[PDB]
Design a protein around this ligand. Structure first.
Ligand SMILES: *[C@@H]1O[C@H](CO[C@H]2O[C@H](C)[C@@H](O)[C@@H](O)[C@@H]2O)[C@@H](O[C@@H]2O[C@H](CO)[C@@H](O[C@@H]3O[C@H](CO[C@H]4O[C@H](CO)[C@@H](O)[C@H](O)[C@@H]4O[C@@H]4O[C@H](CO)[C@@H](O[C@@H]5O[C@H](CO)[C@H](O)[C@H](O)[C@H]5O)[C@H](O)[C@H]4NC(C)=O)[C@@H](O)[C@H](O[C@H]4O[C@H](CO)[C@@H](O)[C@H](O)[C@@H]4O[C@@H]4O[C@H](CO)[C@@H](O)[C@H](O)[C@H]4NC(C)=O)[C@@H]3O)[C@H](O)[C@H]2NC(C)=O)[C@H](O)[C@H]1NC(C)=O
Ligand SMILES: *[C@@H]1O[C@H](CO[C@H]2O[C@H](C)[C@@H](O)[C@@H](O)[C@@H]2O)[C@@H](O[C@@H]2O[C@H](CO)[C@@H](O[C@@H]3O[C@H](CO[C@H]4O[C@H](CO)[C@@H](O)[C@H](O)[C@@H]4O[C@@H]4O[C@H](CO)[C@@H](O[C@@H]5O[C@H](CO)[C@H](O)[C@H](O)[C@H]5O)[C@H](O)[C@H]4NC(C)=O)[C@@H](O)[C@H](O[C@H]4O[C@H](CO)[C@@H](O)[C@H](O)[C@@H]4O[C@@H]4O[C@H](CO)[C@@H](O)[C@H](O)[C@H]4NC(C)=O)[C@@H]3O)[C@H](O)[C@H]2NC(C)=O)[C@H](O)[C@H]1NC(C)=O
Ligand SMILES: *[C@@H]1O[C@H](CO[C@@H]2O[C@@H](C)[C@@H](O)[C@@H](O)[C@@H]2O)[C@@H](O)[C@H](O)[C@H]1NC(C)=O
Ligand SMILES: *[C@@H]1O[C@H](CO[C@@H]2O[C@@H](C)[C@@H](O)[C@@H](O)[C@@H]2O)[C@@H](O)[C@H](O)[C@H]1NC(C)=O
Ligand SMILES: *[C@@H]1O[C@H](CO)[C@@H](O)[C@H](O)[C@H]1NC(C)=O
Ligand SMILES: *[C@@H]1O[C@H](CO)[C@@H](O)[C@H](O)[C@H]1NC(C)=O
Lengths: 205, 99, 269, 205, 269, 99
């Protein structure tokens, strides 16, 4: 079975990053490991195009993955990333097409929510960012402290609202003291329908 | 966005054994700009070569020219070895006299 | 005078110095010829090759060195800020220049890229920077933090560029109107099963515009798989490949066109 | 394939409700539809024990479900609800055991969060309940207005926090006016480790 | 006097009246005999059958009617509030009573259920209600909303109950110490392939305690699959089933024990 | 929590055809308390029967006694029909003389 995953939105957005289209097949079998990956972009076959399958030996079977690296521009201009897996134990070339959305994007609403007073009775508090009314579900939220990365956050999966939009919450747990000292916190949201695929909203005491 | 280099070796004037000339390796189409480049004689590095200023093209990929004075013979092999991230093992390209 | 031929600047900066690269460096071009070089380690704008005999006003080179030192600053700074907010290593590039309109004014160019992709532009007639990505904000905001930057960028593009270009067409006429014609050679070698490959090669010419046409029994036959490259001294080198049936070689000729030639030049095997 | 689902926690909690253990098999086949469901509770077979399979005709195959009704007491005292599916196209009796957790429960933290000021620029606002640090993931949140059911809410799936706990958010969208008129809202959380399996926390202007 | 034999009350309320049920109703019991009935439609506590000849003080029945009217109120109200907060239909029940300690004081009982499951208790020596479910709060909180409720509940259980029980043992001695012995019959009928089933049946007795023993050739053989049920007039009815091999019937006898009999009673087919 | 009723039919005194007696149907073990109960003679409802007060047991399930005066014969069939939610179709239970 051949699954085909997109590049991470951050990684197609940022020229400093590198976008990859990952073709994950789980099976293939022994006696027939000879899965010829075929990578097409729009129409054209890319040979390698720096395609890189690295073999794994799992379960009772093999887990084989090839990673096609994408031009930021192409995916943003939505080309079709067609993965094809061959073999002989396999009567037909397993074909898989991805590209982005194609649209109609909805811009996320980023409001930052302070801890509750009842929670200042705890000596760790929680910082909340509500990101709502986006489309597609393809988003990326992160947190910062003062100006620098906070690793201490948990983001909920996008869940579909009554609207026909998606929403999420992201919860930064900081120290009660760290909040009370009027220290600046911030949630930094990345989605297609944002100003430069990027926005940021600040929580300060 | 990474891009593997294109490598092309050639000479200034029409070649003739035993006659002084200049060897040229033109490395282009690459990204990032961090690259290693050497001129080889029989698989071993030639000392003291020259290079032009590093530039780039309308599509952003980089290009540059390594060169030196040489006299072609019938037995001596000349090449251009290049190391870059996109390359797991370096690439060696041999000089073709009809170019 | 070759009215309007482009004057263009190539600019770059990088965080990784493991292969001995300078932190910032620039090259400048008049059409296809490079007339200037500059890096942060020397901090001087020097003319390239032939451009050293050009009669210029006493202050010509001091002024180019000044503009370039400004750019160097804006670029090296953009990298440190990116390094602070995002893990990784970065490569920053720019393309800036102009071309003359018939009434002699400017038609400019100004674009930027980050890690291999275009992420920003700058319109000199408005003074603003644009983009569409999270790093556009980080960089554009950093550069706005001193209004003069924008003002000096609009002047380099709409005033200095056209005056430099206009002075070059005149003082540097011999350089721009040179047509060193190509030296030609045609050869044949073995190909894939039952085939042969002909290679027509052109040595030491200027300008870079040249046309190839292969002929079978005196009749146009295609132009072959062609390519060009720099020659190390101001002139260029090119070549075209054609696959023919084995034994069929002596039927072909190679013919080239070039501004340095009075009429086309037919070449023989 | 035989899946076996629990009763809804609310339904095992409330004597006014009726708990059901649902055995959902998807396949069975034609020529062999004869899937004898077997229902065991702790050790003992319950015959029917008001077991009720109702046939569905799907896909290209059959979707068969039998619903064993449970005594509140028994499930709360954690008996094993063992579903077994027979047939002849099926070489072996497909066995499935459920019961509850067995433990170690963690009591949820229910804080109610007001709309942001930036959101009072909208003329619909959102009311948020953060429910954190529970275990197991088996919870049920609901909303009320003044004292009566609000149907206008969306609850996110329990997602596992750094803690080794679960958390969720639930978002009540009300009218800006409806909030501004100092009207009482409330989130009513039901989980095993709560006072009577039930708690409630109020949002008022 | 039969010291301490339980006095117990059965209470219920429902929302669905499609089968003609009253909204609230109660029954009261002395050991196994029911001495009282009451429903919201008559609002009177009346004695059951034999209990009408008991010599009681002039105010006996007026006082039972009062306590029951109180309970009726607390129960009917609990349903409306549940109906307001949760969709559905409800059934509410309670079990309240006592038994005498040797020094003559009370050992009480008080438990509650909602839609078939126990959800609440009440300790009379502390005056508090307990539970573990969301509806416990809804109901318990509603009942606390007037402190006297709790106080009058502790008194019904720790004072009135034991005084009633103590007056019943005396004034109602003939009723409690009656032993109407059972009338017996033993019969045989066809069973499953090759088997027979014997049925020993006992008519019109009081008290309900009776022991069955089957005998094969004068020797104890088991007690069979037995059951009991009410008889419509104060006495009871019981029966036990035994499976034997076909043709084997005449070897069995049935024997019963009962407080109304001087010694066991052997029965014949 | 729902519970189907248990149904048991029997007589007061030892039965004898042509001799006046009382028929008893004892319905127990049920939940909810909403239930329909009738005494049948040859499958058709008998008019004007009696019932005891509705009560319940230590496990909370309900119980009650329907009854009436009757004279058994050799041909007449007596039963007890009961309707309750747990029952898709009503249940009819016939009187067994050895009970
Ligand atoms: C033998 O064993 C192996 C392995 O088993 C493990 O466990 C054993 C106990 C042990 O002994 C070992 O063997 C081993 O540890 C079994 O393999 C499993 O096989 C199943 C299928 O049978 C797979 O399940 C699918 O998973 C998809 C999601 O996959 C992601 O998540 C899972 C869970 O975390 C990961 O395991 C997996 O690796 C994937 O992670 C993502 O990977 C990509 C690529 O690496 C990441 O890419 C990023 O790329 C950028 C590029 O710039 C950047 O580089 C980043 O750094 C990279 O990380 C990406 O980030 C990862 N994601 C995250 C969050 O980190 C499911 O989508 C899939 O479900 C779809 O298909 C099935 C089948 O049709 C449907 O039933 C299902 O409904 C769904 O269908 C439709 O899919 C659409 C797309 O999702 C969806 O939109 C649509 O709504 C949906 N339709 C409906 C109606 O819902 C499926 O669940 C497992 O992933 C695989 N396990 C592993 C470890 O690989 C094997 O089966 C077994 N053999 C047997 C049992 O016979
Ligand atoms: C032919 O078609 C049919 C139907 O297809 C539809 O679509 C076609 C396009 C169309 O043409 C039609 O045919 C049709 O419309 C295919 O059937 C599907 O088959 C797959 C499996 O192949 C099933 O997938 C599983 O789903 C489980 C979850 O199921 C719930 O959610 C789904 C999605 O919403 C529902 O569809 C489903 O009905 C279930 O809902 C819950 O149901 C219960 C019972 O009704 C509800 O009960 C409540 O009970 C109380 C009692 O008091 C009260 O009465 C309430 O009112 C009741 O509602 C309950 O509330 C529902 N829930 C909700 C939220 O409402 C998955 O769990 C399951 O996944 C597990 O197993 C697979 C396989 O091993 C694993 O890969 C997977 O990882 C996971 O494994 C482990 O499971 C643990 C338990 O979940 C978990 O804790 C653990 O972490 C996990 N392990 C890991 C490593 O992750 C699986 O996904 C589909 O449900 C089924 N579709 C339908 C509609 O029934 C059929 O396949 C197809 N044939 C083919 C293709 O060949
Ligand atoms: C001429 O070119 C054809 C297609 O592309 C060429 O080959 C690739 C690999 C690159 O080198 C590209 O830049 C070239 O243009 C080939 O199919 C064909 O074989 C080539 N023919 C000859 C005779 O060289
Ligand atoms: C005696 O009882 C055995 C097990 O239980 C009985 O039957 C079930 C269905 C209920 O009626 C339960 O209350 C009874 O106790 C039976 O296996 C056995 O067959 C019964 N024997 C006879 C002779 O009736
Ligand atoms: C353009 O500039 C040159 C030099 O100043 C001048 O000779 C030419 O006539 C100008 N053309 C116009 C239209 O101004
Ligand atoms: C219990 O009460 C009865 C009646 O008042 C009395 O005769 C008996 O002796 C009492 N026993 C004790 C230990 O008080």
């Amino acid at each position: 079975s051949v699954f085909l995953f997109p590049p991470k939105p951050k990684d197609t957005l940022m020229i400093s990053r590198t976008p990859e289209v990952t073709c994950v097949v789980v099976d293939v079998s022994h006696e027939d490991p000879q899965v010829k990956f075929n990578w097409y972009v729009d129409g054209v076959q890319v040979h390698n195009a720096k395609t890189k399958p690295r073999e794994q030996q799992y379960n009772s079977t093999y887990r084989v993955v090839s990673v096609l690296t994408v031009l930021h521009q192409n995916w943003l201009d939505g080309k079709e990333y067609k993965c094809k897996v061959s073999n002989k134990a396999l009567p037909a070339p397993i074909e898989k097409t991805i590209s982005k959305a194609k649209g109609q994007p909805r811009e996320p609403q980023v409001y930052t929510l302070p801890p509750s007073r009842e929670e200042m009775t705890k000596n760790q508090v929680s910082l909340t960012c509500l990101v709502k009314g986006f489309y597609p579900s393809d988003i990326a939220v992160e947190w910062e402290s003062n100006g620098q990365p906070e690793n201490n956050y948990k983001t909920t999966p996008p869940v579909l609202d009554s609207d026909g939009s998606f929403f999420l919450y992201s919860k930064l747990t900081v120290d009660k003291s760290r909040w009370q000292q009027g220290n600046v916190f911030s949630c930094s949201v990345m989605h297609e329908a944002l100003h430069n695929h990027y926005t940021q909203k600040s929580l300060s005491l | 966005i990474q891009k593997t280099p294109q490598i092309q070796v050639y000479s200034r004037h029409p070649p003739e054994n035993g006659k002084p000339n200049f060897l040229n390796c033109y490395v282009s189409q690459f990204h990032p700009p961090q690259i290693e480049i050497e001129l080889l004689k029989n698989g071993k590095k030639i000392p003291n070569i020259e290079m032009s200023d590093l530039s780039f093209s309308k599509d952003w990929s980089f290009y540059i020219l390594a060169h030196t004075e040489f006299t072609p013979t019938e037995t001596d092999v000349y090449a251009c070895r290049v190391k870059h991230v996109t390359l797991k093992e370096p690439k060696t390209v041999t000089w073709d006299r009809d170019m | 005078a070759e009215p309007r031929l482009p004057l263009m600047y190539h600019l770059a900066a990088v965080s990784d110095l493991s292969t001995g690269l300078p932190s910032f460096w620039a090259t400048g071009w008049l059409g296809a010829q490079q007339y200037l070089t500059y890096n942060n380690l020397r901090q001087e704008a020097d003319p390239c090759g032939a451009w050293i005999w050009e009669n210029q006003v006493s202050w010509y080179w001091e002024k180019e060195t000044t503009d370039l030192k400004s750019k160097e600053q804006l670029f090296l700074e953009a990298i440190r800020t990116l390094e602070n907010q995002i893990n990784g290593t970065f490569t920053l590039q720019g393309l800036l220049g102009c071309e003359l309109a018939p009434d002699n004014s400017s038609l400019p160019t100004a674009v930027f890229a980050l890690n291999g992709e275009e992420f920003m532009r700058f319109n000199p007639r408005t003074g603003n920077w644009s983009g569409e990505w999270p790093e556009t904000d980080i960089v554009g905001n950093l550069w706005m933090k001193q209004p003069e930057a924008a003002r000096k960028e609009s002047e380099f593009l709409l005033t200095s560029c056209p005056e430099r270009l206009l002075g070059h067409l005149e003082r540097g006429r011999q350089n721009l109107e040179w047509k060193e014609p190509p030296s030609m050679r045609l050869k044949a070698r073995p190909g894939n099963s039952g085939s042969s490959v002909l290679t027509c090669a052109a040595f030491s010419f200027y300008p870079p515009e040249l046309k190839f046409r292969f002929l079978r029994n005196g009749l146009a036959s295609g132009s072959g798989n062609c390519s060009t490259g720099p020659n190390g001294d101001g002139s260029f080198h090119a070549w075209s490949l054609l696959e023919v049936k084995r034994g069929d070689e002596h039927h072909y000729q190679c013919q080239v066109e070039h501004e340095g030639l009075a009429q086309p030049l037919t070449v023989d095997l």
